[model samples]
Target: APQQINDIVHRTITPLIEQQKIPGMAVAVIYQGKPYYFTWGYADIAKKQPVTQQTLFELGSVSKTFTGVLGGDAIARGEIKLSDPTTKYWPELTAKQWNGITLLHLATYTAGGLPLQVPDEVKSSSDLLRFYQNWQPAWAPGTQRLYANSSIGLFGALAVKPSGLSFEQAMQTRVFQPLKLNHTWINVPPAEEKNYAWGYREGKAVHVSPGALDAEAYGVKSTIEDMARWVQSNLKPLDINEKTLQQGIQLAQSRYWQTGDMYQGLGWEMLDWPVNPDSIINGSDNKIALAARPVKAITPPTPAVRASWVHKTGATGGFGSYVAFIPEKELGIVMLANKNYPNPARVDAAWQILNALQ
Candidate 1:
């Protein structure tokens, strides 16, 4: 089986990286609660450092799935209700446009038409509040499903508000600690900085700045070893003292909205397993990602093996990452790269590897 997996990687993955000119990548496959890892290229090209299981890469919007989990956890604990209005949590925040919007709308990317990023004038929390106060939706709430960072980030902020913890602190206490994910972080501490991979663009190294609401948007950084733990948790919910986390895991994976073939959960994309992989690859393309349309709310069945698939893709300046898992098979894949390569290729490679593992 190891030989077969290796041969598949060499045949499908190796040539993918070579063709894309990616400098480095880290991949992990979790099968039956066990981890098998593979690495290629370098974590730091100038230093000639190779990527390993411990090498940290920026997770970008894969962080959204974490936020989704946290939100579900809060909802399960009765700390917040999805039906509650934004004004219920943050009374000072108000706008005519927000009349019917709920935390659920924000988390599901159905909060009218919020942009992908916060406006330039929104420099701080107060600025964001002010913007929301005067802002008006481009369409009626729940009438459109636009892929938006601001909506989900706002959902995350509200989700943690009742817990009396900052987003980072809440994530640590509620997620990282409970799951024993030591190698994952919202911001890599000074000591762990050396393991962080350097991202590249056009053959030149680049720096990633923390944008407004970054913690709720694209701020998480993690290593493959820890990500494997996350994948395992998704396959089989973590058994912890807090019963709500398990409940939330189920809720997070449920389909809350649908638009044709695309189904949206709390923070993950849901697809039918054994479905064509090209559909996923095409969905990750930027043009489709930016297109806005309405999605009907529906209560789909809880994700089950051979019945459904869960996946998400994330990208920042220099990094690209993808994660997918089949609950029925207990098989999942995580791929992280330092270079900004084509996401469709990443999806295809991961799909091939998953098929081999299956």
Candidate 2:
């Protein structure tokens, strides 16, 4: 039976690997609260290194999942409110420019017209605030969805204050420690350096480096072992008795707005479970992700919605990742590859695996 699982994985993943020229991939899946792990290819092809359980793949915007949970936890604790104006945390931005901009606007990537990346000119957090002070909104926030690291980065930075720790420290103390995701890191240190997978772009080794919002937006490196646990934590909190982190995870999963076919959560995307492939692929495609689409707010939003295909995609210079879970089935999948591949391919591959298992 387990061999059957292996066959199913290779059938879907092999073609993707061959066609995309991916250097390596780590798949961590949870079906019915049971975890199955698999790996293939090489972390460093020229060096003849095979992907392993310990190989840390960059999470890119999938890193936003952590940021979303953090914000949700802050909200759960009353340290921050969804309607809290961005001006509350970033007082430097004048009220005129930021009046209607709330934390929820930033969390949902609906903060007016921010670019996909932080503007190139901004070198530091202060520069980012300056950029915000000078910048103008093209549309009313909460009226349009524009996916961007620029917005969530600000949200994540603001989510940091409740713990009275630095951003990294707060994540370690509040998010990672509670969940016991021991191997994930915003910065891969010297001791764990050996496990950091050498992500590939055009047969050349690459990985994310320090920059503005790097930690907040797209700078997490983690192994499949830890990610499998992460998927499980979402199904139900790690400890049955815990509520703070559990509430945060649940709040992160709630649906807040509808933009086209996709529903927006704090750091995740939501859709009906047993969703059609076209729906997932369309939401993942460049048009929905790269262009601004008007958002329709979901009134009297569900505080926590379980029957959802909650998902997100993240890509760095050399890494690509997709994570999705069907809370209704306690099922989830995490697909991480060293080579950045198209979103549609990742979505299709994971879709096949989930369908096969069920």
Candidate 3:
């Protein structure tokens, strides 16, 4: 049975919002597939509007989760295989060493060395592929942990092409419809324009962060209601064949590499959390603050606490979001904020509130 959420949960979470000075946020928690919701602050600071479950926000890297779904679906349909070379689908790749790199490596982000973000030379999807052809990595695939935007973005592009669909089309047909995530969109539709939340800059002088990302790396916009559907999918695992799901989760749940206290899995991340200052050791180098939670000279975690939880958080110019689930507990939590707050610790802050309720 679903546990009743009470004032303590509300009280615990509300203060974080106030302390963070977040303009508006929409939160939803699901336990054993049942959902409870809370939304506060203003979705539109200029208009003084409140956030809602339907309020659209950019999903940042969580967009990659959808790409993973497409990959799994393609594999299930015999359209692709994890062992297939990325070059088999794209054909433009020319690196001699890169020939051995497989789709699984890309999905797991263990391809060659870690090169994050698109190179300035890339202007389109094809250009992106061309850039990879000439690039050489110092590290061999699956040997190191290097989080990157371009590698993942390229993976998305390849998945769409071989699936006989464009990225946008594939997202609609493969993920959105089946999941009933009606409010989610790769391209925010015109009718939902008024409800779109604007992204903010730190000083008002800085420009807004770009809402879109390379299709593979970070490009996606969705709402918390839509994300709840996704959380359920992770807990239950669906659509893709059992073999693909096994490989995918094995890669996702396995430790790819480390950045201080955190672990990287295929496309998802593990936060060995509820930790002290010593638990944090490295900065994840992303703009997100939670990425930098570990202060310097911290002691490492005890063996027992390793691999307790897994998650993925996202951010865009005007949107910030997080999805975390403890599969053992059958509990998932999602927080979507309208403002482009720089702190990633908000991820942890949200977790504390959920734990209190649990």
Candidate 4:
């Protein structure tokens, strides 16, 4: 069985490397409480350094899952309410457009008109705050789901602002430390810098790119080992030592909004298992890669409560990653790469591996 699975891994990933679609990749799978990892090619193609399970990869927007989990933890602890207005915590966000914009709006990407990224003119938190101060909604709050990193970043800020902790501090104390994820970080410490993979775009080396809401939205860096732990936790959260945190993980995975083919729960997308994994992958690719409005209304896939999978894909200019789990099957997978390959490719590889395992 191990040989069979290993064969599947190579079959799924080797072609991508051969095709030059990805410079290097590390994949981890957790099945029945055991972890298996496969690594290939080079973390630094020029240096010819190979990737390993321990190499750190920028998580890009997959970092939102961390923020989403943190928000769920806050709600579970009674630190915030889903329906509470954003102004309740950040009085500076009192623009008329902010009216009726609740924590729920931000979490579900239903904050109406926030753009996918902060405007170029808004360069820092102060600039972001000033931009939000006069922001106007294109549609009424709760009327639509428009995937906006700025909205979620603001939600992340408001979530932790009340606790007197920086977003990084809150995540460290509330999520990372609690999960014993030593290799995870908002900013990879100097000591661990060597383990951080070097990313490349078109054969040109690149480093982590910074942005105004980097910490709150798209700044997490981690290893396949740590990501497998994260996927493991999602599969069996009750095994966590803290009961409340376990509940928080459940809340984070619970469905909050339905937009066409995708059902969003905090940061993860849900889909019925054994359905066309390509549908889930392509649909999510469009959501992240395009700026389509209203997302076209389709019947949401039946909720995952019975049997489904939850997943998130992430990419920066240089690196790409995907994390996914099926609670019913008690299986999870994490794939990290130094090159930004197409999401369809990522999904196809994941589908093959998961199908073989299942």
Which candidate has the top score in lDDT? 2
TM-scores of the candidates in the order shown:
0.95, 0.97, 0.81, 0.94
Q: Write the per-residue lDDT of candidate 1 for residues 154-273, one digit (tens) a residue.
A: 999999998999999999988888888998988888999889889888887764686778888888999999999888887888545567877677778888888768788888888887
Clash count, one per candidate: 1, 0, 7, 0
Better of 3 and 4 by lDDT: 4
lDDT of 4 by residue, 1-358 (tens): 3787778888878987677568888988777678899998788777777898889999988999999889888888888988899889878876788888899888878888788887767777678889888777889877777777888888898888777889999999999999989999999899998788888788887876778887887899999999999998878888988766787787778776666556677777777776587686676575553453564323342233536678888888899898877888888789999988778777777887888888
- Which wins on lDDT, candidate 2 or candidate 4? 2
Better of 3 and 4 by TM-score: 4
lDDT of each: 0.84, 0.85, 0.64, 0.81
**Candidate 3: residue 272 lDDT (0-100):** 62
lDDT of 2 by residue, 4-120 (tens): 677878899989999999989999778788888989988877778889988999999999999999888888778898889888877888848688899999998888987688866
The alpha-carbon deviation from the true structure for residue 268 of candidate 3, after best TM-score superposition, in angstroms, is: 2.0
Q: Alpha carbon lDDT of residue 338, candidate 3?
A: 67
